[PDB]
Structure 1
Amino acid sequence: SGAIYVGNYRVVNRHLATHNDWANLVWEDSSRDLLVSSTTAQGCDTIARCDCQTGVYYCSSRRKHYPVSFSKPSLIFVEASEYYPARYQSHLMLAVGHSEPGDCGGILRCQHGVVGIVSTGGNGLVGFADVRDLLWLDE
């Protein structure tokens, strides 16, 4: 679990969105595994606006942060799960690292701010849904 709170928005993995998230829906994209809902309380996370390929992510299944090198956002094949059929997930970045189901939502950060959130795992890889292209999150 985990979310990004920036301005009047809450960013979460679409497969983990709640009833309240869907009742206050702003934007969702099944191909990216992202959903943004509106909030009443103001958020203070900073979104990175960059092309960094190194950062640190929080891994809840180890209660640790790990430094990683990660790929640029791209369409990557993701195995079928109970939430989606087998498909290409877009705007996904992979790194070598630990990620098990409950790790989704863990933030990936570089020196400039929030880069994205954990969205996939398995086979010793961790995939992060990028949020750096969502320029409207700040306006």
Structure 2
Amino acid sequence: SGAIYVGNYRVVNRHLATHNDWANLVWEDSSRDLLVSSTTAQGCDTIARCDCQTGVYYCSSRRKHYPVSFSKPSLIFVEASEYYPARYQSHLMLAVGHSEPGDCGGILRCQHGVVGIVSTGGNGLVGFADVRDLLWLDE
């Protein structure tokens, strides 16, 4: 579990979105596993606007933060689930690191701010849904 709170927005994994998220829906994309909902309270997370390939992510299955090198956001493969069939997820970045299903929602950050959230993993890899291209989250 986990979310990003920036301004009047909440960014979560689409497969983990609640009834409230869908009742206050701003934008969602199954291909990116992202959903953005509106909030009453103001969020203070800073979104990074950069091309960093290094950062630190929170791993809830270990109660620890880990430093990682990660790939550039690209179209990558994802096995089915009670959420989605086999497909390419777009805007996805991979790193070598520990991850378990409940780790989805953990934030990845660089020196410039929030980069993305955990969205996939397995076999010693962890995948993050990039949010740095969503310029509208700030205005």
Q: TM bucket by the smaller chain?
A: over 0.9
Q: C-alpha displacement at 1:133, in angstroms?
A: 0.1
Q: Which runs of 5+ in 2 are unaligned?
A: none
Q: TM-score, normalised by structure 1?
A: 0.99
* Identity in percent: 100
Who is 2:39 aligned against?
39
Determine the C-alpha separation between the residues in 2 that align with 1:22 and 1:82.
18
Who is 1:30 aligned against?
30
Q: TM-score, normalised by structure 2?
A: 0.99
Q: C-alpha displacement at 1:80, in angstroms?
A: 1.3
* Secondary structure of 2:31 counterpart: coil
Who is 1:52 aligned against?
52
Determine the C-alpha separation between the residues in 2 that align with 1:99 and 1:82.
19
* Secondary structure of 1:137 counterpart: helix
Determine the C-alpha separation between the residues in 2 that align with 1:98 and 1:121.
8
Determine the C-alpha separation between the residues in 1 that align with 2:35 and 2:18.
10
> RMSD in angstroms over aligned alpha carbons?
0.3
- The runs of at least 4 consecutive aligned structure 1 residues that moved more than 3 Å come to none
Q: C-alpha displacement at 1:101, in angstroms?
A: 0.5
Determine the C-alpha separation between the residues in 2 that align with 1:60 and 1:14.
19
Residues matched between the structures, number: 139
Q: C-alpha displacement at 1:82, in angstroms?
A: 1.5
Q: Which range is displaced more, 124-133 or 77-86?
A: 77-86
